[model samples]
Target: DISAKDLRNIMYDHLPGFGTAFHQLVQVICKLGKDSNSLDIIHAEFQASLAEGDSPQCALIQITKRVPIFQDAAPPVIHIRSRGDIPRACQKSLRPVPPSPKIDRGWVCVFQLQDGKTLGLKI
Candidate 1:
């Protein structure tokens, strides 16, 4: 029963120090929520992607439908269309969240499309 704005805050809080690309993705999801009845953030995974001293690069978000019958249903992954924005040098000075080996570490919410289908987003 989460709103788009709620999801945005959760994302910003959990994944900080991300660049324009990450922010853009958040905006995109918020916009999608405006058109839909509701949005659920099932799980989100963030990767610093700074192996070569690079900026924060991708994220994975999972969402699910909000139907009464499928309240606890499994969701799918939604890939982000935007690319990383910040440069490596800027991120080098700051410490970002470490990447996880799996997508188990994530924030959960719910997303219900017009067709009552659940979706997961990834970047």
Candidate 2:
């Protein structure tokens, strides 16, 4: 009977230097049943790797990165601070403007930017 490790080695042998991807996936499996942050990081890396290439294997990995095993259950909300100053996503309306009456004290607005443009601050 083929063991799990043997199967792992066989798959990895087909793709040399895929060890990084394998280890990342293993860490993800180990860290399952926890918060989304850890898995998000691993998935982000795997996503980047797949995006950098074009192959059937890469496509499959990308799919797996998005929907991990056992994560068919409702996903935990993943919040990232796109703008360091804005802690509340609901109040992002304040962005692109100077300190407004809409803003409470100690709060600031963030803004969007283009390649050569700055965010929030006057150019």
Candidate 3:
């Protein structure tokens, strides 16, 4: 079984080209996983989304609450956003932008902007 540390290392090794913000998000995601599969899926999807050039303004990573029925389950979905829409979108969602406290049972959202800057939101 792959430990969270092992998964973190693997992610770093595989996606070495990503910036600091992305790696930081990776650390958070690693801890959210109950097992390797969740981590693998998140990493795979994140990589695939980047490959598509879908989000020009920023790379967004969202982690939802775990499933209660399936105790070992991971987030049900992930989101990617483009352009300057993130700020407005965030506000509408009532999610606190960067410089805010970490989320508890709420979701975790991270944005790695085009300028290599990062913003975190915990709703």
Candidate 4:
């Protein structure tokens, strides 16, 4: 496992321009970790919607739609939440790993879904 800070630095340092919003979002959630944010609300809805165990893609779309960030635009036709992370249908979202190897319960990630694989944050 990696330290949460190291995991964050891995992405910010190696892939500076990728998912620019995601980098800033880390700071936002740290400050808001103790408070309520739209993410938390979406997460709750996700849990409720999938109480009976739905497929990853289906669950992802349901959760993604409720996010306030996604409200400004059309939603994806398909999406998946990461196994133990955020964004999709979300991908395996790999950040270039730092030489070293982590998680906190509270965090924020911004995912922007686009067309035909232009620039993107995989997860």
Candidate 5:
């Protein structure tokens, strides 16, 4: 398991080299798992990365290289933007994104961009 100090150090060392997105994610991982006096640090780091456009999994892997003690946790699931959580899903527009086969676990949400193109974010 990664101690809070470990996460902080790993993030602090990497902060100068990464973008705000990846940095935001690090702050979140630290915030979510460990409380710190740097809540302002957490607050500032919020727009969540890339060599600067890679996936979150890639971001996680990059951090793992800098600090190998990531505690073997899984990466955050990709989430689709613009989709409401379940309770409000049906309230969306009549023109909707195509649906997916429901998963046995995790919340599934969808997004519709221009031209009816869509994407899903599940976690």
Candidate 6:
């Protein structure tokens, strides 16, 4: 089992907004790592779309190759959530990680959200 504080600190160092988001991920990962609990999940939460339409939902799947994460891809696409631990995005993304196309290149994703839903990507 992983200490929540330890996990949170590491995440905070590499990631920075809502602690709840990381908390939720830690919950799922730990649970998933356990017996009979390994599976994909939409662990994130969202509010009801008031307009009840497309809602302009989007996914800025940025892959980053760092830390202990999936290491089976190239040029890791890092997801930087607009509303992630960073608290806010500056309408731009951090400098891309060095292009490492090595097989098993570790990767991680950051989510950019607004009003609780993913927002269209912008530079």
The top-ranked prediction according to lDDT is 3
Candidate 6 structure quality by residue, lDDT tens digits, 8-107: 3433443334433333333323332232222221111111221233121211121111112323433322244454444233324423334443322322
Model 2, span 1-123: residue lDDT tens = 433354344334435453243333332232341333344444444446656774534532443444444333221222334444332432323324443411112111223433332233211
Better of 1 and 3 by TM-score: 3
Per-residue accuracy of model 5 over 1-123 as CA lDDT, tens digit each: 556567656555655444333443554456544543433333223223343565654544344333322334333333334434322423332133333322222112334444445543333
Of the candidates shown, which would achieve the greatest TM-score relative to the real structure?
A: 3
Off by over 4 Å in 2: 26-56, 59-68, 73-123
Worst 10 residues of 1 by lDDT: 101-110
Candidate 4 residue spans exceeding 4 A from truth: 1-36, 73-118, 121-123
- Tens-place lDDT digits, model 3, residues 1-123: 666787677667754344343454455567666443575555555456657774411333433223222233322223435425454434434333434334333334455556555445443
Q: What's the true lDDT of residue 38 in model 1?
A: 41
> How displaced is residue 32 in candidate 5, in Å?
0.7
Residue 103 error, candidate 3, Å: 5.6
Looking at model 3, residue 63 earns an lDDT score of 33
- Once fitted onto the true fold, the runs of candidate 6 whose alpha carbons sit more than 4 angstroms away are 10-69, 73-86, 89-91, 94-107, 110-123
Candidate 4 lDDT (Cα, 0 to 1) = 0.37
Taken over the whole model, the C-alpha lDDT of each candidate is 0.37, 0.35, 0.46, 0.37, 0.40, 0.30
Instruction: Pick the winner on TM-score between candidates 2 and 6.
Output: 2
* The 10-residue segment with the lowest total lDDT in model 5: 100-109
